[PDB]
Amino acid sequence: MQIFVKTLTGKTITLEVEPSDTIENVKAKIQDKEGIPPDQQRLIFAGKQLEDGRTLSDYNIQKESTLHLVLRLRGX
Amino acid sequence: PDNFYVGQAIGNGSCFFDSFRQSLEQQTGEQVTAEKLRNDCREFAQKNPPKWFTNAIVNSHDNNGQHRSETVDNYTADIMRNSRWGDPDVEGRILCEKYKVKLHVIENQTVDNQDLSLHELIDNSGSKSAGEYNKVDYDDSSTVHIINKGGLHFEPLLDRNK
């Protein structure tokens, strides 16, 4: 199924995922497309941070959902 | 969680290391200088570092779209400069391995006008987004705690009890 990921810079990424995909898998897919190491990524859906070790289905994320990608904060 | 407050870190580019240093001292009792922490990262980079580290420092992204990249050889001198900021996902992972601790980071970010405090748990193998199922242990002496309020500065998160 297809989901969307929106960055704070305004970029929309499309991903092909399955309901059983873990959040780790989704971040790896974003690494594959965007070069962003998973440890720099955080994913937000419906106002909540998605936890590694859980699946998209666990969060009721269905086709054509938009997740928000926000990255590690630097400082300093 | 309730007994933790935001402390203060030095106001130069070593604030990541200074925040780590203050929390490590309260949690594990070990007193380390910020400069020693930087040397810990220099030594890691000199001693045949793994592919995860080479790949991270050539692929640093941020929320502004600034891509940063440098070689391992240049990192070994750069990481000793106070101007070179420390990142939880690189320097934090290195220090977690060195000191056998986990690193809890709170990051304040805003999405669609909703302020969030994001919790992350870093250890020697990488970083995980934490919360309700991957819980931060606020009674673990081997977890250190820092916060980034989104103003390009790290502060330690300390236990008012100690």
Residue numbers in the entry:
A (entry chain M): 1 to 76
B (entry chain A): 39 to 200
What wording appears in the published article?
Our new bacterial OTU DUB structures allowed for the first cross‐kingdom structural analysis, from which we established a framework for identifying evolutionary adaptations in the S1 substrate‐binding site that impart DUB activity.
As anticipated, the Ub C‐terminus was found to be covalently linked to the wMelOTU catalytic Cys. The second major insight from the wMelOTU‐Ub structure is the mode of Ub binding, which is very distinct from anything observed in previous OTU studies. Together with additional interactions from a loop extending off the edge of the central β‐sheet, wMelOTU forms a tripartite S1 site that becomes stabilized upon substrate binding. Although this S1 site is on a similar surface of the OTU domain, the distinctive recognition elements (to be discussed in a broader context below) position the bound Ub moiety in a drastically different orientation that is 107° or 167° rotated from the vOTU‐Ub or OTUB1:Ub structures, respectively. The primary hairpin extends from the central β‐sheet and forms hydrophobic interactions with the I44 hydrophobic patch of Ub. Q147 from the primary β‐hairpin of wMelOTU forms a hydrogen bond to the carbonyl backbone of Ub L71, but also to the side chain of N101 from the secondary β‐hairpin as if to lock the embrace.
